Amino acid sequence: MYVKLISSDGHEFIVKREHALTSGTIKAMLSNEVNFREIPSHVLSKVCMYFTYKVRYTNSSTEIPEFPIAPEIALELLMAANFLDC
């Protein structure tokens, strides 16, 4: 029902399995938990925000809002994004 996504700095993110399954990479690492030795907190908190954003707004006719990304965080998020295939 839920899985745990652990970051480089050991913050623990608990997210519905379905949401996490937005990442093909994570989909494969599963099928309990997953550790990400090279993804920091500040980045993985945004990824999980994306999974929930993705699952809410896909297949929607009622105007989607932008996904906001702070410039400070763009580069790392790009790398994580690329790795996780999402």
């Binding site: 006719s61 989607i64 809002p65 690329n82």
Partner: protein, 137 residues
């Protein structure tokens, strides 16, 4: 060839820009060529004279990021309402976008990342490419 049909049967259309981007409407000629029209500021609407079976797509005026229209990629006037939306971009493409919009394209070389993310940045969204990816389907 993905082209407008030359029906000559008028068809009034409303373009509503339900997105935060400056939208650029694009009409595909009878010869298949993308023809750009005046830009739609974010949130605004515009009444348009088109024709039945004609073909339109919409893009971000500034960055050519693709957008959806009535949930799909192409809009064709019937007997009309054209609602223009952000797709749910992938988180990666979404990141490319912000990076692209923050960095002069000559300086992609200077950023600290895999060589393959350098080539992703350089591979700008583009109407001609999208027509090829849509012509195959």
């Amino acid at each position: 060839v993905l082209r407008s049909v030359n029906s000559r049967e008028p068809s009034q259309v409303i373009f509503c820009n339900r997105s935060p981007r400056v939208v650029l409407p694009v009409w595909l000629n009878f010869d298949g060529e993308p023809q750009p029209y005046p830009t739609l500021p974010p949130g605004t609407g515009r009444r348009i004279h088109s024709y039945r079976g004609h073909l339109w797509l919409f893009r971000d005026a500034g960055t050519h990021d693709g957008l959806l229209v009535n949930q799909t990629e192409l809009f064709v006037p019937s007997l009309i309402f054209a609602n223009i939306t952000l797709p749910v971009y992938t988180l990666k493409e979404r990141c490319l976008q912000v990076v692209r919009s923050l960095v002069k394209p000559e300086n992609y070389r200077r950023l600290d990342i895999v060589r393959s993310l350098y080539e992703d940045l350089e591979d700008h969204p583009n109407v001609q490419k999208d027509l090829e990816r849509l012509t195959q389907e």
